[PDB]
Amino acid sequence: MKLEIFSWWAGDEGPALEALIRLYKQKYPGVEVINATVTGGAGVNARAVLKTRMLGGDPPDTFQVHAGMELIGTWVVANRMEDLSALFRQEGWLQAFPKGLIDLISYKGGIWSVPVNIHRSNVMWYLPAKLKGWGVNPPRTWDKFLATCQTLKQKGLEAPLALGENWTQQHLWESVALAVLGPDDWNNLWNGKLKFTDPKAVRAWEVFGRVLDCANKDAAGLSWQQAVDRVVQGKAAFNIMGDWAAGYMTTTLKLKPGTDFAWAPSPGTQGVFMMLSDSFGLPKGAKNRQNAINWLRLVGSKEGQDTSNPLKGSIAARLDSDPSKYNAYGQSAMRDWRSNRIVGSLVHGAVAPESFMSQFGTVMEIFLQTRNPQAAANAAQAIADQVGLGRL
Numbered sequence: 001m002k003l004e005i006f007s008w009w010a011g012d013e014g015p016a017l018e019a020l021i022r023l024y025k026q027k028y029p030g031v032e033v034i035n036a037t038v039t040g041g042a043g044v045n046a047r048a049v050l051k052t053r054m055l056g057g058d059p060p061d062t063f064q065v066h067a068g069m070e071l072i073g074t075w076v077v078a079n080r081m082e083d084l085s086a087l088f089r090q091e092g093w094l095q096a097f098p099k100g101l102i103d104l105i106s107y108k109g110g111i112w113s114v115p116v117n118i119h120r121s122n123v124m125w126y127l128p129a130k131l132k133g134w135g136v137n138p139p140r141t142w143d144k145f146l147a148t149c150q151t152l153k154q155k156g157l158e159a160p161l162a163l164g165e166n167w168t169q170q171h172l173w174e175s176v177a178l179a180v181l182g183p184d185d186w187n188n189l190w191n192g193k194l195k196f197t198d199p200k201a202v203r204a205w206e207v208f209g210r211v212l213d214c215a216n217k218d219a220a221g222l223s224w225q226q227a228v229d230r231v232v233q234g235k236a237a238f239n240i241m242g243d244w245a246a247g248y249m250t251t252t253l254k255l256k257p258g259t260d261f262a263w264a265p266s267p268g269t270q271g272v273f274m275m276l277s278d279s280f281g282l283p284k285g286a287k288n289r290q291n292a293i294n295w296l297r298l299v300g301s302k303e304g305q306d307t308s309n310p311l312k313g314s315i316a317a318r319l320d321s322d323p324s325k326y327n328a329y330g331q332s333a334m335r336d337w338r339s340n341r342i343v344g345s346l347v348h349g350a351v352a353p354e355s356f357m358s359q360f361g362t363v364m365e366i367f368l369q370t371r372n373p374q375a376a377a378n379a380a381q382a383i384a385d386q387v388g389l390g391r392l
């Protein structure tokens with residue numbers, strides 16, 4: 001009796017998963033659980049290893065996958081996943097999750113994964129006591145961000161913005177783009193109604209370049225956790241990162257939400273929640289099909305989600321989630337999830353297929369070397385044209 005769970009929740013990302021696995025083993029003492037993590041932030045490495053496994057005809061029993069175009073445009077369109085519609089009926093999940101989330105996991109009459117959480121992409125992290133020590137406020141717009149960072153440089157803080165490796169630069173970019181475009185024109189990139197070469201979308205790169213000039217110059221070789229660490233250390237004032245950062249700071253670093261660290265929407269994005277969702281499905285050919293199905297039933301349940309998510313920094317995907325199980329951050333995110341305008345993340349798989357996502361890092365490289373907004377815009381448009389962005 002075995003179950004092989006594939007994810008990128010290695011190292012200090014693992015507590016939430018490990019808690020779920022312990023729950024699973026209580027319920028199913030027969031099963032030996034193989035925790036098959038591929039180490040690498042945002043699944044860049046996991047994507048590559050999964051590709052080798054799937055094309056080699058050696059699927060894991062289940063794998064971490066983002067709800068939306070990431071899921072649909074890769075293993076679903078390739079006819080490598082089982083339709084979970086019957087399981088959804090069995091478990092009452094069509095009423096348990098918000099309709100918009102069901103839509104992201106649904107395609108051509110099937111339902112293809114089970115959401116375990118909701119993460120938010122557009123969060124700015126800072127330390128209220130450090131900000132007071134520097135005599136500044138948290139910025140609510142990109143203009144105020146840039147002005148505050150200049151003030152901070154004058155006060156001796158060389159790199160007021162913490163930043164890491166390539167994907168985290170893309171991560172920062174999607175917050176900047178959302179602020180510059182607003183939610184409607186953000187959405188219009190992904191349905192092809194707004195071109196990347198439109199002046200409105202070229203401006204995202206202009207603002208992004210200015211913001212980049214506030215960042216640590218060693219960013220390229222740092223993990224997302226190391227970039228958060230710079231803020232905790234006061235070697236930076238701000239970091240733009242998903243709320244897995246809240247999980248890190250509380251679960252791993254034991255910081256108190258609200259006093260030892262704080263949060264706001266990314267500048268210019270207040271009232272908009274840029275979401276992503278980690279989900280698990282059922283690959284065809286799974287060696288341990290029933291054990292995988294029982295894992296899906298667990299990760300889709302209130303018991304599972306309210307055990308794991310408080311550790312993770314995400315909120316539950318289930319509508320019936322108990323807010324008393326969440327700290328001050330989780331409760332704040334829960335409120336915003338219900339009240340805000342929702343849009344999807346690019347970097348975390350909601351809005352664009354992997355064909356585009358995987359090439360966007362190249363676009364980002366060419367912005368870092370040229371610092372030319374038009375070149376970056378033109379590059380993103382060329383990729384969009386090559387992959388037929390909007391066709392799925």
Ligand SMILES: OC[C@H]1O[C@@H](O)[C@H](O)[C@@H](O)[C@H]1O
Pocket residue numbers: 008009013040041042043119224242244276277278347348
């Ligand atoms: O690695 C950092 C993060 O990457 C996201 O793509 C993922 O959805 C999160 O669960 C977390 O793992």
